Design a binder for these strands. Structure first.
Lengths: 98, 74, 49, 113, 138, 129, 179, 151
RNA sequence: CAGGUCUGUGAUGCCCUCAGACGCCCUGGGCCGCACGCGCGCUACACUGGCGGGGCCAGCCGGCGCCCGCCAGGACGCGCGGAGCCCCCGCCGUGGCCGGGACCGCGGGCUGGAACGCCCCCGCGCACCAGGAAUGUCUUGUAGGCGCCCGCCCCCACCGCG
């Protein structure tokens, strides 16, 4: 059975290692090539000032969300083996699907 | 101000055509200044003059129709 | 006072942090004060650049 | 003149439902589709009761209800609508049928520069 | 290819004339006293407008190829801006009821097929669009 | 080319030179709430076609003109839509202002004091009043 | 130009203006973004017809509308060829050459007369011919194209009627007086 | 319409041998040459019919620089997605010239067609990047700021 | 720098109120009231245009279908899917006019508990024919023209950020 895997990482460097680990754990289970979802840019522009006094300077805050595409043809136990096998780094999105 | 023609040229139309034919070139707006026709009327009579072949349209554009008499060479 | 208290129904969207009902800025589903968001947007991971 | 083609004598006898297609687009949405509300219906019943009671009664129907659209029956009733500080008296007349009480209550004073 | 080689506007005007003689569409009553679009405040002065539009809807469906998109998508194709406002001008879509009443009429005459969702040019209709293009080619 | 000069419909002066659609664009100013060619020009228009139009304008719901395309749509006297022009627009506008004067309404007071009714900023853009 | 009017023998007759003028490097139709605003004098290497078509796109309204302008100078060009029986580009080179004013009294209060560079004369000549047309193409019947062409023919002759010639002569006038 | 897998998705089979591109002002074009009878089509529309009618000459400049022999055998299929009308004609010209270059690229003869085309028109072969700038706060444009009320 | 923010907050001193509260809720009004002066804008003054019948290309990035309705919208199901300007062809013809759409009068919708909100259709046709002293921002994909998206939003942008 083939299971869909999606990983969302805010920091590109933190997901960069995770994608390298994903190939080095599921190679026998034939993990899919890591297509990268186009960045989802969460953008908030807020006036920098607590008040509205002074020039209207704007504070731009952006969270870039990166996502990767993975599929593994393996047993029900085998995805769980890769889920334990992949490098665990904190604050990551883990997806198990059918 | 200007004279709105009302497409009134009848006996006068033939002499109006005579002057237009004499002029080396004609444009839809040139007639309206030279003889006070609406430029819309100028297109009306010009379509008849080209129908004979007195004039040759160098170029047709939505606003500007450039006509030089193919005739008048003789 | 059961009838009197809170008879009127309306949205009362406020910042999660402050409770102010103005500039809620729920653009991405964040119920966040614009002034309060300025205080704590680093933990949410938004970066200035 | 007959209001919207129903003669004034016929209008008082007529019902809002009977004159509803004849009435305004908002009136048809508010009463025909959305429906009225308990406060407004209790007010219509209160208006019906005092006019019916007829004990020689100067209630002058004090009301904070400006949302209410006038009903054909209310003709000849001196309603009083709180403009914000005071109840401004509003007698009912034939073209004021299916018209809100706010339109005839003076919410603000004029400028007088 | 065929109709694509022909200038689409030239093909649309020539085919609309053919559709009228061929009896395709047969314009409804409402179309004489209606102005296409919520943006346009003036009715078309063409008097053959419901035929020129009907060449546009069926040829644009030929352009769909296999899309099976609907009437609102075609309405967007003929949309323009609403003016007459102090506020700046913004694009408003074409009136759907005119567009619905030609795509339904085309399917009713079997020139179009309702495979799923909207409509794609029917094989019987596919000959018609190519046929006229061949007449234009010579 | 056949030409006729000024014509009068509903006591208005009509320029023969302009296209029929422009010629009727205003009747007594308050007029433009058909069977004739609209591009022919007012001078080109025949008496007979004008007579058919005269019937069309007097009774719009008789030749395929719609209810929505009418000047008046629900009335206040008959409850029915109609097309009124010339003096009737002036008499009904007077009648509509008189109805607004009759009962006290915000619509009534503003129309008299000349303040815009249903309008918003009277503070900065009603100047020259 | 417009599949017509080759610049085979079209050339400048005024030496100083010729150095800053283009009568050879013309791409078909007056278009092509060559960034002739770049560096310093890239104007010299820019097709005069483009320079003219770029002037028309000004005074708001027709701002950036090169295509409309390209077909308008094409309509004017055909009018020029037909009226004078002459390649329009040759008349154009002469019109923008004569129009450029050779003496201008800048401030250098007082003002002093100072000689004008060939590039400035090249740019003023193009500018004045368009404004001579733009002004006479406002609430008038003749289209912008017919004025642009009217202006060009007189400018080649030097007839004061052309707005460009009158402004050139008025510029050299207040210059002679404030020498 | 922006740099997707759209580049090859339009044609299945009918393998094109020479691939070329022409991209300016966000308007990107992918040109595929099967080297058949020499005819050129852009977006299903023959190159001799181009929507701007004055800008058919701009598109037919590579063809005007070299003789008919070069285009006698080069069959080009072009697909322009995105950008704008004028950015699409400008893109077409760049792609057609990349196609001639790709036919003679291995030989030193690539130099001849690059010199002749470029000398007549710059950007016939090259593509000027000139991308759009970003609006900044306090203005309606990168180089435009709102009128200052006082001082 | 006593520039601005104690009215963003479980940041806060001093202070004021505290049970007919300067606490909180509930209802109705006000911020949008207008002789007038000004600041940021938006639409103009027409034909390098309005009209409007087609072609047709966007980017931050993105849903549609079927009928009913002039529209506005609505019913009903499903996952889908893209500008203006400009281009050609008509048309009007230098006429406050076929420019301009401000106000007004009937209606038809919508959102909400409610217009006093918005949208649309038929009307209606104000100034305005290029703006004095002054002034304001800009040098490449730039000025300008031209559309679109989101924020705050029940509805609504001549706004802001893009």
């Amino acid at each position: 059975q083939k299971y869909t895997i999606i990983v969302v990482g805010k920091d590109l460097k933190l997901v960069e290692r995770y994608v390298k680990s994903i190939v080095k754990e599921g190679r026998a289970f034939g993990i899919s090539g890591p297509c990268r979802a186009p960045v989802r840019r969460l953008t908030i522009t807020t006036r920098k000032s607590p008040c509205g006094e002074g020039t209207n300077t704007w504070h731009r805050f952006e969270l870039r969300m990166y996502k990767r595409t993975f599929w593994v043809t393996c047993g029900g136990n085998d995805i769980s083996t890769i889920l334990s096998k992949t490098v665990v780094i904190p604050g990551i999105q883990v997806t198990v699907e059918v | 101000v200007d004279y709105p023609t009302l497409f009134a040229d009848e006996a006068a139309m033939n002499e109006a055509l005579k002057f237009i034919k004499n002029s080396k070139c004609i444009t839809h707006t040139q007639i309206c200044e030279r003889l006070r026709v609406s430029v819309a009327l100028a297109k009306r009579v010009m379509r008849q003059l080209v129908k004979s072949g007195d004039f040759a349209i160098v170029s047709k554009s939505s606003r500007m129709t450039i006509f030089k008499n193919m005739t008048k060479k003789e | 006072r059961e009838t009197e208290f809170c008879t009127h129904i309306a949205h009362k969207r406020e910042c999660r942090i402050c409770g102010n009902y103005n500039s809620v800025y729920r653009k991405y589903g964040l119920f966040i004060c614009r002034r309060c968001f300025k205080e704590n947007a680093g933990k949410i991971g938004f970066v200035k650049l | 003149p007959n209001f919207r083609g129903v003669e004034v004598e016929k209008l008082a006898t007529m019902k809002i439902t009977d004159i509803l297609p004849k009435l305004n687009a908002r009136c048809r949405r508010r009463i025909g589709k959305h429906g009225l509300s308990m406060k407004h219906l209790r007010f219509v019943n209160k208006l019906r009761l005092r006019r019916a009671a007829q004990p020689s009664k100067p209630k002058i129907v004090r009301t904070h209800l400006r949302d209410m659209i006038i009903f054909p029956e209310m003709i000849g009733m001196t309603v009083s609508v709180y403009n914000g500080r005071q109840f401004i008296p509003v007698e009912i007349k034939p073209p004021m049928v299916g018209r809100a009480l706010r339109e005839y209550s003076m919410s603000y004073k004029i400028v007088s520069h | 290819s065929s109709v694509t080689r022909v200038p689409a506007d030239v093909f649309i005007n020539s085919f609309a004339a053919h559709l009228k003689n061929r009896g395709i569409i047969k314009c409804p009553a409402f179309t004489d006293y209606v102005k296409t679009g919520v943006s346009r405040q003036y009715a078309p002065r063409d008097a053959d407008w419901f035929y020129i539009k009907a060449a546009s809807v069926i040829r644009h469906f030929y352009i769909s190829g296999s899309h099976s998109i609907g009437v609102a998508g075609l309405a967007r194709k003929y949309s323009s801006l609403q003016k007459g406002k102090t506020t700046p001008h913004h694009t408003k879509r074409a009136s759907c009821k005119v567009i619905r009443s030609i795509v339904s009429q085309f399917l009713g005459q079997k020139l179009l097929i309702a495979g799923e969702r909207g409509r794609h040019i029917s094989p019987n209709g596919r000959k018609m669009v190519e046929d006229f293009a061949e007449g234009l080619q010579k | 080319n056949d030409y006729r000069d000024l014509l009068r419909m509903f006591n208005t002066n009509i320029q023969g030179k302009v296209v029929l659609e422009c010629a009727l664009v205003g009747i007594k100013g308050i007029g433009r709430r058909a069977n004739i060619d609209v591009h022919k020009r007012a001078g080109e228009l025949t008496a007979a076609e004008e007579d058919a139009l005269m019937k069309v304008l007097e009774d719009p719901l008789s030749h395929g003109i719609p209810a929505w395309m009418l000047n008046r749509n629900n009335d206040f006297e008959s409850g029915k839509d109609m097309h009124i022009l010339v003096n009737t627009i002036a008499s009904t506008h007077r009648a509509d202002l008189e109805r607004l004067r009759k009962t006290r309404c915000e619509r009534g007071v503003r129309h008299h004091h000349n303040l815009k009714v249903r309008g918003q900023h009277t503070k900065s853009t009603g100047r020259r009043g | 130009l417009f599949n017509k009017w080759p610049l085979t023998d079209v050339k400048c007759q005024d030496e100083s203006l010729e150095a800053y003028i283009s009568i050879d490097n013309h791409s078909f139709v007056p278009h092509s973004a060559g960034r002739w605003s770049a560096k310093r004098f890239r104007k010299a290497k820019c097709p005069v017809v483009e320079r003219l078509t770029n002037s028309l796109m000004m005074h708001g309204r027709n701002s950036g509308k090169k295509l409309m302008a390209m077909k308008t100078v094409g309509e004017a060009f055909e009018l020029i060829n037909l009226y004078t029986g002459k390649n329009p580009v040759q008349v154009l080179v002469d019109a923008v050459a004569n129009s450029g004013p050779r003496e201008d009294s800048c401030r250098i209060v007082r003002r002093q007369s100072v000689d004008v560079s060939p590039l400035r004369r090249v740019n003023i000549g193009i500018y004045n011919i368009a404004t001579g047309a733009r002004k006479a193409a406002f609430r008038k019947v003749r289209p912008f194209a017919e004025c642009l062409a009217e202006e060009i023919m007189n400018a080649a002759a030097g007839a004061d009627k052309s707005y460009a010639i009158s402004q050139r002569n008025s510029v050299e006038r207040i210059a002679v007086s404030n020498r | 319409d922006l740099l997707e897998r759209n580049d090859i998705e339009v044609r299945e089979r009918d393998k094109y041998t020479v691939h070329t591109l022409g991209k300016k002002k966000n308007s990107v074009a992918v040109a595929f040459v099967k080297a058949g009878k020499g005819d050129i089509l852009v977006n299903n529309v023959p190159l001799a019919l181009v929507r701007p009618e004055i800008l058919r000459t701009k598109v037919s400049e590579p063809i005007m620089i070299l003789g008919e022999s070069l285009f006698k055998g080069l069959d080009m299929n072009i697909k322009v997605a995105g950008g704008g009308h004028v950015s699409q004609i400008y893109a077409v010209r760049q792609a057609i010239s990349r196609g001639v270059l790709a036919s003679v690229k291995d030989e030193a003869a690539r130099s001849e067609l690059r010199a002749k085309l470029v000398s007549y028109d710059r950007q016939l072969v090259v593509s000027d990047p000139r991308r759009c700038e970003a609006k900044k706060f306090g203005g309606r444009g990168a180089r435009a700021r709102r009128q200052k009320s006082y001082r």
